[PDB]
């Protein structure tokens, strides 16, 4: 089926300490498999997955050396961004980065991602073509002019189309629960359809007793994790659609 890999890097400067805290988290198929934290014993890339433990010692040395590089990269830009926005000392700031590859059933890349955000808001992003940049603030114009004049897109394109899709394949060659549903009858009467113990989070509930879907009221909650590798969801006011289901459920 379809697969993916993502790296959520975060750097936060806080009034009180000299160097900002830097975290990097990796996901294979929307499941965490490795992490780095500059606040650790002595920071390094540790496995967060059962099937990741079999990686060579040379593998964690290169990855940890890279994270030290990103750390510095985030420390300089964070200082650069204070000037772009005419901020002074005293506040807390966040630079975030999301990169990754979505590949398909043919094992080839479908779309890569490279996107940055400052203070939680979008800052600059590599488009779907991997060649151009999208920048919203006028402060991000300085950056887009810098990167498109220093060939950043072509470098990131080489990672997305090369290292990303290659290594995600190697990770997957090292390693689908359907929901059990109930309905709560409690009258206030409002009905609630629960979907529990499914993986992945691909779920879709719906309320149609008359054959027509409902959005007037129809209060929902977005899929949330249970304390283990599953997820749950309920809907208010019951066909349940899931990738593991051969036929959507029916309960009333």
């Amino acid at each position: 089926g379809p697969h993916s890999m993502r790296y959520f890097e975060t750097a936060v400067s806080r009034p009180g300490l000299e160097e900002p805290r830097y975290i990097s988290v990796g996901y294979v198929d929307n499941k965490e498999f490795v992490r780095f934290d500059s606040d650790a014993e002595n920071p390094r890339y540790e496995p967060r997955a059962p099937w990741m433990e079999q990686e060579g010692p040379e593998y964690w040395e290169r990855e940890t050396q890279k994270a030290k590089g990103q750390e510095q990269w985030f420390r300089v830009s964070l200082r650069n961004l204070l000037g772009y926005y005419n901020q002074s000392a005293g506040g807390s700031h966040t630079l975030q980065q999301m990169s990754g590859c979505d590949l398909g059933s043919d094992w080839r890349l479908l779309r890569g991602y490279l996107q940055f955000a400052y203070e939680g808001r979008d800052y600059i992003a590599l488009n779907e073509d991997l060649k151009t940049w999208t920048a919203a603030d006028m402060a991000a114009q300085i950056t887009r002019r810098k990167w498109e004049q220093s060939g950043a897109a072509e470098h990131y394109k080489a990672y997305l189309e090369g290292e990303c899709v290659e290594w995600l394949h190697r990770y997957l060659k090292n390693g689908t629960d359907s929901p059990k549903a109930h309905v709560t009858h409690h009258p206030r009467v409002t009905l609630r359809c629960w979907a529990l113990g499914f993986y992945p989070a691909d779920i879709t509930l719906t309320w149609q007793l008359n054959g027509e879907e409902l959005t007037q009221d129809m209060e929902l909650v977005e899929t949330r994790p249970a304390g283990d590798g599953t997820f749950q969801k309920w809907a208010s006011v019951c066909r349940v659609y899931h990738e593991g289901l051969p036929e959507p459920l029916t309960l009333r």
Binding site: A67, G69, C164
Partner: peptide, 9 residues
């Protein structure tokens, strides 16, 4: 494998 940025902001 984690990416590795070139030019700063």
């Amino acid at each position: 494998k984690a990416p590795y940025n070139x030019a700063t902001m």
